[PDB]
């Protein structure tokens, strides 16, 4: 006899199990610790080959979309064309010295633009830029014995020169203003919300009034 | 540190000193006067303890006194007793540290006295039998 | 390098070894006098060598090696034999790790090996 149980909905009627007549459709993870070891070995090998270049290329800081992640910051695909122009770096030459470049980003506000321009300027001042020919150095490049002092960066995020993401600091304690202790904020917010919510109905009423 | 009550709860079911052969629970603890597997008898986890044994033809009484319970080298004392010692003085030597084992101490002291006497007689009789019979070999352990 | 953590693999490699591998596996210790001279612990055995048996029914027996029967993992020693029912004499195999080498049949290749293995 069944009793008071939930209705199951288990979703398992599609020949997923390997038997004498069915190949099955399964995925196991017995190689998980072995693949973790292999990926780590390749990262160390790549670092040895490309020395002294940084492991990861420079990336910009961007804002996450939607209202759920409005306040969060992360790393983007590449730098904007407007940002590169502001820092005085050509885009095709920028890709050569380890700067990611994105030709689709738009830079819709100055706050995001100024943060990323500062990232490029700090990176430029920290580059050492080994000369193409050691006998004949052209343009401002690394001097002698400045090459011998270079060191690879393995920060896993490329933050050796630029650093972490920039977020506004928390506000400090203060006093309540006299107008803050009087104004009704629900009345203020509801009035604005009703203006958009009842835009169509109010227009219809005025049109009928004429 | 921790107490006897806590330690007994930890080792009661399983231990290297617990022998559970044929459904009988006995103890191989060297500081157990009789082989009973109980909290009172088990002297290795008790703060103070005393056991009576033999050393040749004399009574040997080892005691703990529970003041160096973190140094195994200095836990116990030897205290070899005099020949022909009465069991009352051995009974009084114990019960100054464990008064709740005084009656068990007297019985153990008497049993140790009887065993000493028997060992002398059995060995004496065995040697007499071995005196006359001939043997094909005899092994002598080399010196130094 | 036959010995392995896999017992199944180590035993297959031993009992299916080729002929040139079996030559190394069939080695015997040198005597004290040879060790003091050549400073070598042990050498592979070969025909026309002199050995002394150390383990088994033939203890203390000496002789010259007559054959290296690699297919049976044994060596044959002269004067180490048994009688058949008809009276015929047949050699008896002895494992190479039960003997010791007392005299070596020197050769320009064998001398090269001794200098290779000289510990000093």
């Amino acid at each position: 006899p069944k009793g008071n149980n939930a209705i199951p909905h288990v979703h398992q009627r599609k020949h997923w199990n390997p038997c004498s007549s069915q190949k099955g459709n399964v995925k196991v993870f017995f190689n998980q610790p072995a693949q973790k070891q292999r990926r780590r070995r390749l990262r160390l090998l790549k670092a040895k080959k490309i020395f002294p270049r940084p492991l990861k290329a420079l990336r910009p800081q961007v804002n996450c979309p939607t209202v759920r992640y409005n306040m969060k910051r992360r790393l983007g695909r590449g730098f904007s064309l407007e940002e590169l122009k502001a820092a005085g770096v050509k885009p095709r030459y920028a890709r050569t010295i380890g700067i990611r470049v994105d030709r689709r980003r738009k830079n819709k506000s100055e706050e995001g633009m100024n943060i990323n321009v500062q990232r490029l300027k700090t990176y430029m001042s920290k580059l050492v830029l080994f000369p193409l020919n050691r006998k004949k150095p052209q343009k401002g490049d690394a001097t002698e014995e400045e090459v011998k002092a270079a060191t690879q960066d393995r920060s896993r995020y490329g933050t050796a020169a630029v650093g972490g993401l920039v977020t506004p600091a928390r506000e400090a304690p203060r006093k309540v203003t006299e107008e803050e202790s009087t104004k009704k904020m629900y009345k203020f917010l509801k009035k604005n919300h009703s203006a958009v919510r009842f835009f169509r109905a109010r227009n219809r009423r005025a049109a009928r009034k004429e | 540190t921790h107490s006897t009550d806590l330690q007994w709860l930890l080792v009661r079911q399983n231990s290297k000193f617990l022998q559970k052969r044929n459904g009988i629970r006995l103890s191989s603890d060297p500081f157990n006067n009789n082989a009973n597997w109980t909290k009172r008898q088990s002297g290795f986890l008790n703060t103070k303890a005393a056991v009576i044994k033999t050393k040749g033809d004399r009574i040997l009484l080892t005691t703990k006194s529970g003041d160096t319970n973190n140094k195994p080298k200095l836990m116990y004392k030897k205290t070899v007793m005099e020949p022909g010692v009465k069991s009352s003085v051995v009974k009084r030597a114990v019960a100054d540290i464990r008064p709740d084992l005084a009656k068990m101490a007297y019985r153990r002291a008497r049993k140790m006295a009887c065993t000493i006497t028997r060992m002398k007689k059995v060995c004496a009789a065995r040697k007499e039998r071995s005196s006359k019979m001939h043997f094909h070999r005899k092994t002598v352990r080399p010196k130094r | 390098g036959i010995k392995c953590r896999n017992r199944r693999k180590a035993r297959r490699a031993h009992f299916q070894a080729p002929s040139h591998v079996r030559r190394i596996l069939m080695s015997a210790p040198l005597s004290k006098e040879l060790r003091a001279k050549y400073n070598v612990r042990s050498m592979p055995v070969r025909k026309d060598d002199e050995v002394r048996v150390k383990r088994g029914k033939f203890k203390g027996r000496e002789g010259r090696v007559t054959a290296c029967y690699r297919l049976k993992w044994v060596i044959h020693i002269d004067k180490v034999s048994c009688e058949k029912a008809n009276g015929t004499t047949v050699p008896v195999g002895v494992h190479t790790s039960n003997v010791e080498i007392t005299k070596l049949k020197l050769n320009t290749r064998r001398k090269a090996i001794l200098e290779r293995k000289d510990r000093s």
Binding site: N4, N5, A6, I7, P8, H9 | - | -
Partner: protein, 63 residues
């Protein structure tokens, strides 16, 4: 509790309290959700498949 037995044996000058059990989620599921005057929460797997209109609901009270 070993300090209490040390300083207050026989429990003089004590106030004994228990703690609540009626607010638990398991208790809310006791009974049948479909009988009159029940107010029992059903065991629901798909929340959207057990909604029901405002009418057609069972009677909320019974003597």
């Amino acid at each position: 509790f070993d300090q209490l037995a040390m300083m207050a044996p026989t429990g003089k000058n004590t106030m004994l309290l228990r703690g609540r059990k009626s607010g638990r989620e398991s208790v809310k599921h006791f009974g049948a959700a479909g009988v009159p005057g029940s107010h029992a929460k059903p065991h629901v797997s798909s929340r959207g498949k057990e909604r029901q209109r405002s009418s057609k609901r069972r009677h909320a009270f019974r003597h």
